[PDB]
Copies of this chain bind each other. A is one copy, B any other.
């Protein structure tokens, strides 16, 4: 009788009843699983990340608790979802989806993995069968789809809200399902997600750019798991959470426009996901990084002596990462098109260490940044949104004081774009192995690598056993 908003019904129906049949989705989801966990492990090398991990109260004991990869923490699933989601996102190294809204749908793994691990351990304690990694993969496919299809035509950034609302929405649905919710519970959780927090994006932008860019998605996935658990206790929903006149999400926050699902939900997002294969860096600078690295040998010994650097880019890069003047922390820097491009030119490589004070204090960087001129190419802006292409284009050309110049080096498709997928896969696996090596000893690193890259047998691995760190 009360009449639930269509978008919430459609998400619910997809989660509960849609069968995923794409081989290619499952194969790509396997890559996203390892790539994401690798990113999370690498983040344990960063004390700014680690300081936010662990239980609220040290020495808390949680029966059948979710384990946090790379650690000895055993946590409630909400807290574990925060820990994992915080890790995997921290270094701006994880996967990415770009349309009307921006985001990183792998962020949902925080909630998915924590909830699937908890459910598995509880089942085991009750003498029942745990979930398998294939269940994790399916839930990732569906989380990706929900967040990514929402992102196609709904721009939260244009109304000043962070993208992580779509993480909370996607996680809440897939978590509710994992935890055994039916149609009513999933609907009710979703409605509570839409009514909830929508965090601002003040921390992703000048002058306030900061480390909340790294942990907001963890906070949102965690919240989704929490809302799902409340729903499983039978807490009531809000049928017209989106549409209610005056008080609904659409009228309050979305400029009275309808939230829309631009296509039927299936496996399109996972199939077309973007990887950050080589460099941690804000995605809109990934191709400027690639072009800078190409130019590096031509500039490395001409080292100051550069008169100006031209950077041609697309509109999203201008809106987010186009900054002049002092940069104050690693988040600020890794969200700076000019900084990233300077690192590529100066060093021929980009690692998360380049964003730290030790490197940033190199006086050459800021001198080279103040020579950079960033302008929009309107064709790049168009091609960024065109469905058969979805390029993320930048071009870079260096001019010298003698009047000569390098060629203008243009990159439309970074190595993580679907068009370069066959080339990328072996490099993704190298990235995974390198990331594991930073944290795990030889025996454990080789064992994880081996299990995770044997995709056939991986499917049938129990989730609790898979969480072997």
Given contacts A56-B77, A202-B195, contact A235 B211 (CB under 8 A): yes
1/0 per position for A59-78, CB-CB distance to B under 8 A? Answer: 11111110000000000111
Number of interface residues of A (CB under 8 A): 59
Choose among B59, B118, B161, B247 the residue that contacts A200 (Cβ–Cβ < 8 A).
B247
Which chain B positions have C-beta within 8 A of A56? Answer: 76-79, 229
Question: A202 and B61: CB pair below 8 A?
Answer: no
For residue A243, give the distance in angstroms from its CB to the closest CB of chain B. 10
- Give A196 to B164 CA distance when docked, in angstroms: 11
Question: A251 and B51: CB pair below 8 A?
Answer: no
Question: B207 and A240: CB pair below 8 A?
Answer: yes
Question: A208 and B244: CB pair below 8 A?
Answer: yes
Given contacts A197-B200, A247-B160, contact A240 B208 (CB under 8 A): yes
User: Does more than half of chain A's interface fall in helix, strand or loop, or is it mixed?
Assistant: loop
Choose among B57, B235, B240 the residue that contacts A65 (Cβ–Cβ < 8 A).
B57
Choose among B63, B200, B230, B236 the residue that contacts A249 (Cβ–Cβ < 8 A).
B200
- Give A79 to B55 CA distance when docked, in angstroms: 12
Which chain B positions have C-beta within 8 A of A253? Answer: 160, 200
Question: B58 and A161: CB pair below 8 A?
Answer: no
Which chain B positions have C-beta within 8 A of A252? Answer: 159-161, 200
Choose among B60, B197, B229, B244 the residue that contacts A198 (Cβ–Cβ < 8 A).
B197
Question: B60 and A76: CB pair below 8 A?
Answer: yes
Nearest first, the 3 A-B pairs at minimum CB distance are A160-B252, A56-B76, A61-B61
Which residues does A use to contact B, with CB under 8 Å?
2, 51-52, 55-65, 76-79, 118, 159-161, 192, 195-205, 207-208, 210-212, 229-230, 233-241, 244, 246-249, 251-253, 329
